[PDB]
Amino acid sequence: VDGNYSVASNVMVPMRDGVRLAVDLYRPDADGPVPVLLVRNPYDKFDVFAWSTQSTNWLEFVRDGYAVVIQDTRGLFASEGEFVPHVDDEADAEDTLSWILEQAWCDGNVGMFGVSYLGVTQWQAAVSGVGGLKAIAPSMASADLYRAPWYGPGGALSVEALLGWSAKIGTGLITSRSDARPEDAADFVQLAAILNDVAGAASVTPLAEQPLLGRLIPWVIDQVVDHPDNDESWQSISLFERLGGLATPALITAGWYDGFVGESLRTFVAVKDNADARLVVGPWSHSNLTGRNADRKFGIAATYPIQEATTMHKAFFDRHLRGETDALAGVPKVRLFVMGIDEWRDETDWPLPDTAYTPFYLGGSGAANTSTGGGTLSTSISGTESADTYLYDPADPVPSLGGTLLFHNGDNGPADQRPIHDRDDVLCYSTEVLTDPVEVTGTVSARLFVSSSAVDTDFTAKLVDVFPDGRAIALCDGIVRMRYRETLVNPTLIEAGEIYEVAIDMLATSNVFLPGHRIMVQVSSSNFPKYDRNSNTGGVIAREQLEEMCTAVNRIHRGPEHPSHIVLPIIKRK
């Protein structure tokens, strides 16, 4: 019967090592084999409502004749084995895909879909070389776990993401263990305390001493905290360099305020030349898909469009798993939610063709410290040789407000920055009030000429849309940890007092700065707990006590010989 299906729970699938993973099979009433979609989930395959609202109304797929397999990853819930993030997912996906392809009900065409960890696992599956995998659809995901979500392109630890997620999984690890333990109740209370106060959890020094999380999930220290360089342990689990050799269609979703945004977009660029890639980017953060934030509303159109997403996924799978050549007729290659105008818009590529990468130079009379300073932005090089100076004290870092926060207040991406504008270590540079709109859509970066009293420190840059009423709304930001200025792999310290030209990767955005607005840039040396705080010592940061850390006198140089600037991806549409 068309539209009818059955569900078989806890079908045990043997991996190459004999460890069995549990899957649930959603199989249509059909007369022969069918195309199959696989989802790999560390958050209980039974708990479909937890993630599905951030994805697709995928029961539509089943009603339309696809089978769907949802799997508990190794060591969690109904699966056997031991759980360690990332390290088993390439092999376990390969073995699972192989098992699916062998089944009576599989017609030889398999795809995947899902969000976050259910997205990362799709890249890990895609590098398997399993020919039967015809398409993937990774949403809010990464193919390089160092670059997102654990560290970043600037070489700072994404500490709130790490501690929040580890506490989240810690709840899952206890819930899914064999027998209940006397310490479980107290552990459950302590994990809740972390999730209620992620900045507090991240504030403990040495950062690497995590009695609870290190016990429940040793990986938090053994892999993440202990490996600050993008070293061999990270390279092992990275998929990114293998993406170029694939020819697997990928339907990629991202969010402008999502922790994974930079890495999600990079995956699109990596696969677009060799297969049918599609891109959808909305104004969402990882846990807020509503389009509504405390000081910024994007409109109901911005709410994660789950039925349109479902329709697009089905068309995509119809094309690539069912060989329906015209299934994607009228579907755009790229669909972006352009903020400011607050409208969806179709594009032919990402980056946009006809992106003008335009320097906006830091300038101004007098100090740029605070929002009431004299800092300017201009497409013209600054005429006078100046410098702005501030003290960065690790005991008092600049608090994270919006941006791509994941677990610490991660539901307010476009956050008003005014609460930090009176700080002396927040340097502000803005354009005059705009008389005509300026669209900035693409990857964003800064090139700063900097010096420090320290042998290591951080520099941050944050793009901001200043509204007529004074709201200073965050758009996108990045960090550079100075030891990693030239490489994430082989860091070196800097010489105190020497001027360096450094790049800050500020991920990406799409925003029209409307008439009456200003373009604003904030520069500092911290953004905590989005990123951990530099100790300004050159030491092993995560092993240092707060008292061991040093203050740094940091300086931004600006003028004709040191033309510090932000590079804006300008789009002009007449």
| Binding partner selected for residue 46 from ligand DBC, a copy of itself, Cl ion, none, CB under the kind-specific 5 to 8 Å limit | a copy of itself
Rounded to whole angstroms, the maximal C-alpha distance in the chain is: 78
Binding of residue 154 to ligand DBC (CB under 6 A)? no
CB of 301 to a copy of itself, least distance (A): 7
CB of 358 to Cl ion, least distance (A): 14
Q: Evaluate whether 150 touches 157 at the Cβ level (below 8 Å).
A: yes
| Binding partner selected for residue 406 from Cl ion, ligand DBC, a copy of itself, none, CB under the kind-specific 5 to 8 Å limit | ligand DBC
Q: Quick check: helix, strand or coil at residue 5?
A: strand
CB of 121 to ligand DBC, least distance (A): 9
Per the annotation, the verdict on 116 as an active-site residue is: yes
> Residues 174 to 203: which contact a copy of itself by CB under 8 A?
192, 195-196
Q: Evaluate whether 152 touches 178 at the Cβ level (below 8 Å).
A: no
| Binding partner selected for residue 129 from ligand DBC, Cl ion, a copy of itself, none, CB under the kind-specific 5 to 8 Å limit | none
Nearer to ligand DBC, 55 or 116 (CB): 116
Stretch that binds ligand DBC, among 56-64, 115-123, 470-478, 536-544 (CB under 6 A): 115-123
- Total residues contacting ligand DBC (rule CB under 6 A)? 8
Among 58, 117, 151, 298, binds ligand DBC (CB under 6 A): 117
> Residues 159 to 178: which contact ligand DBC by CB under 6 A?
161, 165
| 182 cis-preceded (ω within 30 degrees of 0) | no
Beta strands in 322-400, from DSSP E residues, in sequence order: 334-338, 343-347, 356-363, 376-378, 386-392
| Binding partner selected for residue 165 from a copy of itself, Cl ion, ligand DBC, none, CB under the kind-specific 5 to 8 Å limit | ligand DBC
- Which segments are annotated as binding site for substrate? 43, 117
Residue type, 431: T
Binding of residue 301 to Cl ion (CB under 5 A)? yes
| Binding partner selected for residue 300 from a copy of itself, ligand DBC, Cl ion, none, CB under the kind-specific 5 to 8 Å limit | a copy of itself
Stretch that binds ligand DBC, among 62-70, 112-120, 205-213, 224-232 (CB under 6 A): 112-120
Binding of residue 12 to a copy of itself (CB under 8 A)? no
Q: Could you tell me which residues come within 8 angstroms of residue 103 by beta carbon, excluding any fewer than 6 positions away?
A: none
Nearer to a copy of itself, 196 or 380 (CB): 196
Residue 145: is it exposed, middle or buried by C-beta count within 10 angstroms (0-12/13-18/19+)?
buried
C-alpha distances in Å from residue 301, one per residue of 336, 356, 410, 439:
12, 28, 21, 20
Show the 3-state SS of 369-383.
EECCCCCEEECCCCC
Among 52, 96, 109, 116, binds ligand DBC (CB under 6 A): 116
CA–CA dist 285, 574 (Å, integer):
31
Beta strands in 219-322, from DSSP E residues, in sequence order: 250-257, 277-285, 292-293, 296-297
**Residues 330, 331, 336, CA angle at the centre, nearest 5°?**
130
Nearest-Å Rg of the Cα atoms of the chain is 24
- DSSP codes of every residue in 231-245: -HHHHHH--HHHHTT
Among 62, 68, 120, 252, binds ligand DBC (CB under 6 A): 120
CB of 487 to ligand DBC, least distance (A): 24
> Shortest CA distance to 186 belongs to which of 158, 211, 159?
211
Sign, CA dihedral 49-344-266-487, equals negative
Stretch that binds a copy of itself, among 4-12, 356-364, 461-469, 534-542 (CB under 8 A): 4-12
Q: Evaluate whether 333 touches 348 at the Cβ level (below 8 Å).
A: yes
Which residue's beta carbon is nearest to the bound Cl ion? Answer: 81
Among 269, 306, 387, 553, binds a copy of itself (CB under 8 A): 306
Q: Which two tokens stand for residue 547?
A: 């008292």
Nearer to ligand DBC, 139 or 554 (CB): 139
Binding of residue 103 to a copy of itself (CB under 8 A)? no
CA–CA dist 237, 132 (Å, integer):
23
Beta strands in 106-188, from DSSP E residues, in sequence order: 106-112, 114-115, 133-135, 138-139
Nearer to ligand DBC, 161 or 542 (CB): 161
CA–CA dist 189, 194 (Å, integer):
9
Binding of residue 517 to Cl ion (CB under 5 A)? no
Per the annotation, the verdict on 31 as an active-site residue is: no
Q: Which of 52, 79, 116, 166 is catalytic?
A: 116
Nearer to ligand DBC, 36 or 161 (CB): 161
> Shortest CA distance to 230 belongs to which of 484, 488, 485, 481?
488
> Residues 351 to 410: which contact a copy of itself by CB under 8 A?
none
Site string for a copy of itself, 260-299 (x = CB under 8 A): ------------------------------x-x-x----x
Binding of residue 311 to a copy of itself (CB under 8 A)? no
CB of 421 to Cl ion, least distance (A): 19
Q: Which two tokens stand for residue 258?
A: 């999502």
User: Which residues contribute to the site for ligand DBC (CB under 6 A)?
Assistant: 116-117, 120, 149, 161, 165, 286, 406
Residues that bind a copy of itself (CB under 8 A): 1, 3-10, 46-49, 52-53, 57, 59-60, 63, 192, 195-196, 290, 292, 294, 299-301, 306-307, 411
